[PDB]
A paper describes a structure:
We recently discovered that FEM1B, a substrate receptor of Cullin 2-RING ligase (CRL2), recognizes C-degrons containing a C-terminal proline. By solving several cryo-EM structures of CRL2FEM1B bound to different C-degrons, we elucidate the dimeric assembly of the complex. Furthermore, we reveal distinct dimerization states of unmodified and neddylated CRL2FEM1B to uncover the NEDD8-mediated activation mechanism of CRL2FEM1B. Our research also indicates that, FEM1B utilizes a bipartite mechanism to recognize both the C-terminal proline and an upstream aromatic residue within the substrate.
Although most of the identified FEM1B C-degrons bearing substrates contain a proline at the C-terminus, some of them, including CUX1, do not end with a proline. To understand how the C-degron of CUX1 is recognized by FEM1B, we further solved the cryo-EM structure of unCRL2FEM1B with CUX1. The CRL2FEM1B-CUX1 dimera and dimers were solved at resolutions of 3.38 Å and 3.27 Å, respectively. The two dimeric structures of the unCRL2FEM1B-CUX1 complex are similar to those of the CRL2FEM1B-CCDC89 complex. In the dimers, the protomer-protomer interface is symmetric. Two head-to-tail juxtaposed CUL2-RBX1 dimers wrap around the FEM1B homodimer interface to stabilize the architecture.
Numbering used by the authors:
A (entry chain G): 17 to 112
B (entry chain J): 22 to 104
C (entry chain C): 246 to 744
D (entry chain B): 472 to 627
E (entry chain A): 1 to 116, 135 to 162
The structure:
Amino acid sequence: MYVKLISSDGHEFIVKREHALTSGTIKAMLSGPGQFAENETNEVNFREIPSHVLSKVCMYFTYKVRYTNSSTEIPEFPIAPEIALELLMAANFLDC
Amino acid sequence: FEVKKWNAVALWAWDIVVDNCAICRNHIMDLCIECQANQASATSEECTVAWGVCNHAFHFHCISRWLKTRQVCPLDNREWEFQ
Amino acid sequence: EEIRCRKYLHPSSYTKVIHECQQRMVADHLQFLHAECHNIIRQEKKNDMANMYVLLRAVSTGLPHMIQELQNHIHDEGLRATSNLTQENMPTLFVESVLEVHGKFVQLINTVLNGDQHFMSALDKALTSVVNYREPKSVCKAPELLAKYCDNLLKKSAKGMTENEVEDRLTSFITVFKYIDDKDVFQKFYARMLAKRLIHGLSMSMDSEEAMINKLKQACGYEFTSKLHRMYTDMSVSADLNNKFNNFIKNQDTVIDLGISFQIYVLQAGAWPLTQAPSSTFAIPQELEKSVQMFELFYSQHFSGRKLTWLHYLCTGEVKMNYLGKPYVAMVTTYQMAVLLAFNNSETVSYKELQDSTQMNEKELTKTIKSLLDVKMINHDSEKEDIDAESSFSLNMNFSSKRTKFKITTSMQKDTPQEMEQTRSAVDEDRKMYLQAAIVRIMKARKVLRHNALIQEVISQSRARFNPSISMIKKCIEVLIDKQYIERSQASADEYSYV
Amino acid sequence: YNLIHLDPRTREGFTLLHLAVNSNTPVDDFHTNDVCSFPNALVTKLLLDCGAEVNAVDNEGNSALHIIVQYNRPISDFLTLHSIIISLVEAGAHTDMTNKQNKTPLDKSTTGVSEILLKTQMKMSLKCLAARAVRANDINYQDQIPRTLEEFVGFH
Amino acid sequence: TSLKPRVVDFDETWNKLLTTIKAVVMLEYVERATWNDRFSDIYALCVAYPEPLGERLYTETKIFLENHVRHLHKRVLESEEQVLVMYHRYWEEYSKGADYMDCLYRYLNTQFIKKNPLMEIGELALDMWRKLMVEPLQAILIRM
Ligand SMILES: [Zn+2]
Ligand SMILES: [Zn+2]
Ligand SMILES: [Zn+2]
């Protein structure tokens, strides 16, 4: 229940599977030829996503899983000006 | 016997062989994908071939617009230089 | 029953009551209708075809028999229409017959048969069957006939065809052409005939050629009209290059008059099918070196990187005979002009004397001499008409120039039909090379496949071009076997492996 | 569907969907006003089933969602408003798309009922948050991102 | 490497992708690394510079699918007596293959097809199966 989203740098980013399945191309990546019936690592290796933006993607996973049934003044997600336009693409690729 | 008029043909090819502009996937000696449609308003003659230092040929538009946002040669990921 | 069902029943049963009364009188007797659709389409009974299409559309398995039998009828009509063509005007008659069959069977489908997409697909299949129709154990005739149709239509014709003629006939030719399933042969024939039209100025108008190239581009992508459009652009920029050459010669540090003219036709090496086939070791004549060296300097200093390989066999020249009495002006080819300069320093010439001057091999010098002497400009000084060492030829002083335009260029001006088989062989060789490269890529990518699956893959990536014959793909597999690139698997010959 | 593919627009840029979700559509006073009440859930659902451009705009950029969220009777006609919002979100509508005044449909919703209906129908997305950050920081997104993202930050 | 719209030659990335989408529609073995990299290949094709190759990718995927169920159909009716069990084997392979290839083509489905008359690859593969293997064989299949 803990996938391991590799970054292009090489940083393992072990996150709970419930969090990582909110994506489109991470739920799709762990479906088919890669399923890990042995559930040993669940590598979702990204050779395109930088580490500094995949960290924010994982933080978004946690933030969305937490602040989903709230509807009452959710705190802002602090996208830095420099990491934006790199996190827009990294969220378009993974389908948010 | 002296002659007054002569005409001739001659095949020409680049010293290093290259066929297609890698960006727009048209020919380097053809118009780029931009001014091919804009062949009337524009001159449709300034679209010359631009030669990188890595012996790669693209249209001048197709590499000038590529270099406006990124800094890399498109085919092989290296720094460019107009030779 | 549809009207009556509204009057009485609930709307929810508007469908079942009609559907259940279809599956009693149009589907219980479906085979009966299916036993007679043939006749309905063989006589093209418009009312009956319309009624039968309306009837069988509701039935699940009723329509496909009508589709297949309409395809059979259109195929038989195309075979009976495009197989009795006279050999005189065959290029126009083939295209016109396929065009009229297409028009008739799209007017029938669109109005009587409501223009169903399946019926149009059946029409397309039948017309593809009749267009790519060949004699037993014979090559296809569609590409050559359609390429000759375009060549005769786009050339300078004496019938006074208007611009609307090439604007409409070519537009309908695109519809006729889209059914050729062997498009590479047509592409190469159109390239060859377009080259022969462009180099000799035989084309009706460059705008018409550009329109035709654009139409073929819209039909079959950009890779089809790559070489053709490059050739057209070369011919369009040749005039600007000649003007630039005039500017260069008039802008030199020392003023230089060319003497001879220079209407240069620069051509791209890759695009044009014109290739330096023979040795062509023809030394440039002395009167032409002044222009040749200057143009080499101009093309090396103004466009650096473009090596200019001269083709000293396609170049014409306006030659005059001052010793004969200066009669009019004569146009010959450069490929023999040097021996004409021999007549400048000796009224009689020998093959040994000519060999040092023109420097080219005599295997074509003899035929150039023959094409010179048939107009009686140069007569046979000796008696031995056969190819001998001495073989004297003299200048026929009694025969003057018959016309002002003494044209010997007509040997190259007209495109000979003897080169059709050579172009066929070139197409075949390029086809083998392309299929070899594609199958090498496939084998290095997959490395595991079956033979029938290999044929399916070969036709899958050959969809974009000519279709390959099964025996041809088998021969390609054989030549891969004897090229140390593919080998028979140990388990069976069906499996193939890449090393 | 023929007219929907034709894409008709009024003088204010209203498409068929915008009028079908607008309460300010002038219904005729003779007999149509006794039956045809706009906005109507059925007409909008049918337009969406016929392929209406859900993410259309007015002259001032208001989509169908911006138009519906300003509805004046969210209590008595809660069925209609709820069904319109459900259909618009299901057919695909950016619940934070910004008009020319940079107002999300939540910012345009006058009533709290429509606000909370949309919030129930709103799905959080990192693409929208990153696009909002890009627009707020005015980062140059020309050719740096796909064209799809080039318009995604266009209306976010 | 990055997610920015770059220029990709279609005949190379598609050739690398075809050996995978041939081997996942047949339920052959493609490892986790290759299957993950094909997602980046699909993305790079769908946002290629300057012309997005999503339309060409969809066209060639449809052509490959109609050249696969056609091959499966030719494999089906040649075994006339056992067309039921052969159809069941090939359908059991092809249903999971279509689902897996729909998973692989998620970016093309949700960023090109839904924007544009076009069927998603999960829907397209089944629709290619119905029009080329069920409907041609509906006379023999339902009879047996
Ligand atoms: Zn270009
Ligand atoms: Zn240009
Ligand atoms: Zn380069």
